[PDB]
């Protein structure tokens, strides 16, 4: 039972999901910064 438990533990994995969310928020922040700087320097 405990070996099967650690088997499902090794199955999950979670690292792809956390990398997905990390790269998503990174791209969002980067796009926000790009738009902000572009608008600011266009106005200036």
PDB file of N, CA and C in Angstrom:
ATOM      1  N   UNK A   1       0.835  -1.198   0.000  1.00  0.00           N
ATOM      2  CA  UNK A   1       0.000   0.000   0.000  1.00  0.00           C
ATOM      3  C   UNK A   1       0.871   1.249   0.000  1.00  0.00           C
ATOM      4  N   UNK A   2       1.883   1.285   0.874  1.00  0.00           N
ATOM      5  CA  UNK A   2       2.742   2.468   0.911  1.00  0.00           C
ATOM      6  C   UNK A   2       3.624   2.573  -0.332  1.00  0.00           C
ATOM      7  N   UNK A   3       4.013   1.441  -0.928  1.00  0.00           N
ATOM      8  CA  UNK A   3       4.773   1.511  -2.173  1.00  0.00           C
ATOM      9  C   UNK A   3       3.918   2.076  -3.300  1.00  0.00           C
ATOM     10  N   UNK A   4       2.656   1.649  -3.388  1.00  0.00           N
ATOM     11  CA  UNK A   4       1.745   2.247  -4.359  1.00  0.00           C
ATOM     12  C   UNK A   4       1.533   3.729  -4.072  1.00  0.00           C
ATOM     13  N   UNK A   5       1.493   4.101  -2.788  1.00  0.00           N
ATOM     14  CA  UNK A   5       1.344   5.506  -2.425  1.00  0.00           C
ATOM     15  C   UNK A   5       2.500   6.335  -2.966  1.00  0.00           C
ATOM     16  N   UNK A   6       3.737   5.897  -2.709  1.00  0.00           N
ATOM     17  CA  UNK A   6       4.873   6.627  -3.263  1.00  0.00           C
ATOM     18  C   UNK A   6       4.938   6.515  -4.783  1.00  0.00           C
ATOM     19  N   UNK A   7       4.335   5.479  -5.368  1.00  0.00           N
ATOM     20  CA  UNK A   7       4.241   5.407  -6.823  1.00  0.00           C
ATOM     21  C   UNK A   7       3.383   6.542  -7.370  1.00  0.00           C
ATOM     22  N   UNK A   8       2.183   6.727  -6.807  1.00  0.00           N
ATOM     23  CA  UNK A   8       1.368   7.873  -7.215  1.00  0.00           C
ATOM     24  C   UNK A   8       2.040   9.195  -6.865  1.00  0.00           C
ATOM     25  N   UNK A   9       2.832   9.226  -5.791  1.00  0.00           N
ATOM     26  CA  UNK A   9       3.585  10.435  -5.465  1.00  0.00           C
ATOM     27  C   UNK A   9       4.589  10.771  -6.563  1.00  0.00           C
ATOM     28  N   UNK A  10       5.326   9.766  -7.040  1.00  0.00           N
ATOM     29  CA  UNK A  10       6.254   9.979  -8.146  1.00  0.00           C
ATOM     30  C   UNK A  10       5.518  10.306  -9.438  1.00  0.00           C
ATOM     31  N   UNK A  11       4.286   9.813  -9.591  1.00  0.00           N
ATOM     32  CA  UNK A  11       3.502  10.134 -10.780  1.00  0.00           C
ATOM     33  C   UNK A  11       3.199  11.625 -10.858  1.00  0.00           C
ATOM     34  N   UNK A  12       2.944  12.255  -9.716  1.00  0.00           N
ATOM     35  CA  UNK A  12       2.648  13.674  -9.679  1.00  0.00           C
ATOM     36  C   UNK A  12       3.432  14.423  -8.620  1.00  0.00           C
ATOM     37  N   UNK A  13       4.028  15.831 -14.514  1.00  0.00           N
ATOM     38  CA  UNK A  13       3.638  15.922 -13.112  1.00  0.00           C
ATOM     39  C   UNK A  13       3.284  17.358 -12.735  1.00  0.00           C
ATOM     40  N   UNK A  14       3.496  17.705 -11.464  1.00  0.00           N
ATOM     41  CA  UNK A  14       3.167  19.049 -11.002  1.00  0.00           C
ATOM     42  C   UNK A  14       4.167  20.082 -11.507  1.00  0.00           C
ATOM     43  N   UNK A  15       5.402  19.661 -11.782  1.00  0.00           N
ATOM     44  CA  UNK A  15       6.398  20.594 -12.300  1.00  0.00           C
ATOM     45  C   UNK A  15       6.018  21.161 -13.664  1.00  0.00           C
ATOM     46  N   UNK A  16       5.514  20.379 -14.630  1.00  0.00           N
ATOM     47  CA  UNK A  16       4.997  21.008 -15.857  1.00  0.00           C
ATOM     48  C   UNK A  16       3.921  22.047 -15.599  1.00  0.00           C
ATOM     49  N   UNK A  17       3.013  21.803 -14.650  1.00  0.00           N
ATOM     50  CA  UNK A  17       1.937  22.759 -14.396  1.00  0.00           C
ATOM     51  C   UNK A  17       2.476  24.046 -13.778  1.00  0.00           C
ATOM     52  N   UNK A  18       3.385  23.922 -12.807  1.00  0.00           N
ATOM     53  CA  UNK A  18       3.926  25.127 -12.189  1.00  0.00           C
ATOM     54  C   UNK A  18       4.797  25.889 -13.179  1.00  0.00           C
ATOM     55  N   UNK A  19       5.482  25.188 -14.087  1.00  0.00           N
ATOM     56  CA  UNK A  19       6.234  25.885 -15.123  1.00  0.00           C
ATOM     57  C   UNK A  19       5.298  26.577 -16.106  1.00  0.00           C
ATOM     58  N   UNK A  20       4.161  25.947 -16.417  1.00  0.00           N
ATOM     59  CA  UNK A  20       3.148  26.586 -17.252  1.00  0.00           C
ATOM     60  C   UNK A  20       2.704  27.902 -16.630  1.00  0.00           C
ATOM     61  N   UNK A  21       2.295  27.860 -15.359  1.00  0.00           N
ATOM     62  CA  UNK A  21       1.784  29.072 -14.722  1.00  0.00           C
ATOM     63  C   UNK A  21       2.883  30.119 -14.557  1.00  0.00           C
ATOM     64  N   UNK A  22       4.120  29.683 -14.302  1.00  0.00           N
ATOM     65  CA  UNK A  22       5.226  30.621 -14.151  1.00  0.00           C
ATOM     66  C   UNK A  22       5.520  31.339 -15.461  1.00  0.00           C
ATOM     67  N   UNK A  23       5.628  30.589 -16.562  1.00  0.00           N
ATOM     68  CA  UNK A  23       5.876  31.232 -17.846  1.00  0.00           C
ATOM     69  C   UNK A  23       4.692  32.090 -18.269  1.00  0.00           C
ATOM     70  N   UNK A  24       3.471  31.696 -17.897  1.00  0.00           N
ATOM     71  CA  UNK A  24       2.301  32.503 -18.223  1.00  0.00           C
ATOM     72  C   UNK A  24       2.361  33.858 -17.529  1.00  0.00           C
ATOM     73  N   UNK A  25       2.578  33.859 -16.209  1.00  0.00           N
ATOM     74  CA  UNK A  25       2.663  35.129 -15.495  1.00  0.00           C
ATOM     75  C   UNK A  25       3.874  35.942 -15.940  1.00  0.00           C
ATOM     76  N   UNK A  26       4.976  35.276 -16.300  1.00  0.00           N
ATOM     77  CA  UNK A  26       6.143  35.994 -16.803  1.00  0.00           C
ATOM     78  C   UNK A  26       5.824  36.707 -18.111  1.00  0.00           C
ATOM     79  N   UNK A  27       5.184  36.003 -19.049  1.00  0.00           N
ATOM     80  CA  UNK A  27       4.810  36.623 -20.315  1.00  0.00           C
ATOM     81  C   UNK A  27       3.815  37.754 -20.099  1.00  0.00           C
ATOM     82  N   UNK A  28       2.891  37.586 -19.149  1.00  0.00           N
ATOM     83  CA  UNK A  28       1.928  38.645 -18.861  1.00  0.00           C
ATOM     84  C   UNK A  28       2.629  39.897 -18.345  1.00  0.00           C
ATOM     85  N   UNK A  29       3.539  39.729 -17.381  1.00  0.00           N
ATOM     86  CA  UNK A  29       4.270  40.870 -16.837  1.00  0.00           C
ATOM     87  C   UNK A  29       5.119  41.526 -17.918  1.00  0.00           C
ATOM     88  N   UNK A  30       5.747  40.716 -18.774  1.00  0.00           N
ATOM     89  CA  UNK A  30       6.580  41.267 -19.837  1.00  0.00           C
ATOM     90  C   UNK A  30       5.749  42.078 -20.823  1.00  0.00           C
ATOM     91  N   UNK A  31       4.583  41.560 -21.215  1.00  0.00           N
ATOM     92  CA  UNK A  31       3.721  42.293 -22.137  1.00  0.00           C
ATOM     93  C   UNK A  31       3.210  43.581 -21.506  1.00  0.00           C
ATOM     94  N   UNK A  32       2.873  43.536 -20.214  1.00  0.00           N
ATOM     95  CA  UNK A  32       2.437  44.745 -19.522  1.00  0.00           C
ATOM     96  C   UNK A  32       3.536  45.800 -19.521  1.00  0.00           C
ATOM     97  N   UNK A  33       4.767  45.390 -19.198  1.00  0.00           N
ATOM     98  CA  UNK A  33       5.884  46.331 -19.198  1.00  0.00           C
ATOM     99  C   UNK A  33       6.137  46.887 -20.593  1.00  0.00           C
ATOM    100  N   UNK A  34       6.053  46.031 -21.615  1.00  0.00           N
ATOM    101  CA  UNK A  34       6.261  46.481 -22.988  1.00  0.00           C
ATOM    102  C   UNK A  34       5.237  47.538 -23.372  1.00  0.00           C
ATOM    103  N   UNK A  35       3.955  47.262 -23.113  1.00  0.00           N
ATOM    104  CA  UNK A  35       2.908  48.218 -23.459  1.00  0.00           C
ATOM    105  C   UNK A  35       3.076  49.523 -22.691  1.00  0.00           C
ATOM    106  N   UNK A  36       3.384  49.433 -21.395  1.00  0.00           N
ATOM    107  CA  UNK A  36       3.558  50.636 -20.587  1.00  0.00           C
ATOM    108  C   UNK A  36       4.691  51.500 -21.124  1.00  0.00           C
ATOM    109  N   UNK A  37       5.857  50.893 -21.366  1.00  0.00           N
ATOM    110  CA  UNK A  37       6.998  51.660 -21.852  1.00  0.00           C
ATOM    111  C   UNK A  37       6.736  52.226 -23.242  1.00  0.00           C
ATOM    112  N   UNK A  38       6.085  51.447 -24.110  1.00  0.00           N
ATOM    113  CA  UNK A  38       5.791  51.925 -25.456  1.00  0.00           C
ATOM    114  C   UNK A  38       4.878  53.142 -25.415  1.00  0.00           C
ATOM    115  N   UNK A  39       3.794  53.066 -24.636  1.00  0.00           N
ATOM    116  CA  UNK A  39       2.884  54.203 -24.530  1.00  0.00           C
ATOM    117  C   UNK A  39       3.577  55.411 -23.911  1.00  0.00           C
ATOM    118  N   UNK A  40       4.380  55.186 -22.866  1.00  0.00           N
ATOM    119  CA  UNK A  40       5.051  56.292 -22.194  1.00  0.00           C
ATOM    120  C   UNK A  40       5.993  57.021 -23.142  1.00  0.00           C
ATOM    121  N   UNK A  41       6.820  56.273 -23.880  1.00  0.00           N
ATOM    122  CA  UNK A  41       7.764  56.940 -24.771  1.00  0.00           C
ATOM    123  C   UNK A  41       7.079  57.511 -26.006  1.00  0.00           C
ATOM    124  N   UNK A  42       5.984  56.903 -26.464  1.00  0.00           N
ATOM    125  CA  UNK A  42       5.210  57.517 -27.537  1.00  0.00           C
ATOM    126  C   UNK A  42       4.692  58.884 -27.110  1.00  0.00           C
ATOM    127  N   UNK A  43       4.139  58.966 -25.897  1.00  0.00           N
ATOM    128  CA  UNK A  43       3.659  60.247 -25.393  1.00  0.00           C
ATOM    129  C   UNK A  43       4.807  61.235 -25.210  1.00  0.00           C
ATOM    130  N   UNK A  44       5.950  60.763 -24.706  1.00  0.00           N
ATOM    131  CA  UNK A  44       7.052  61.685 -24.460  1.00  0.00           C
ATOM    132  C   UNK A  44       7.629  62.202 -25.775  1.00  0.00           C
TER     133      UNK A  44
END
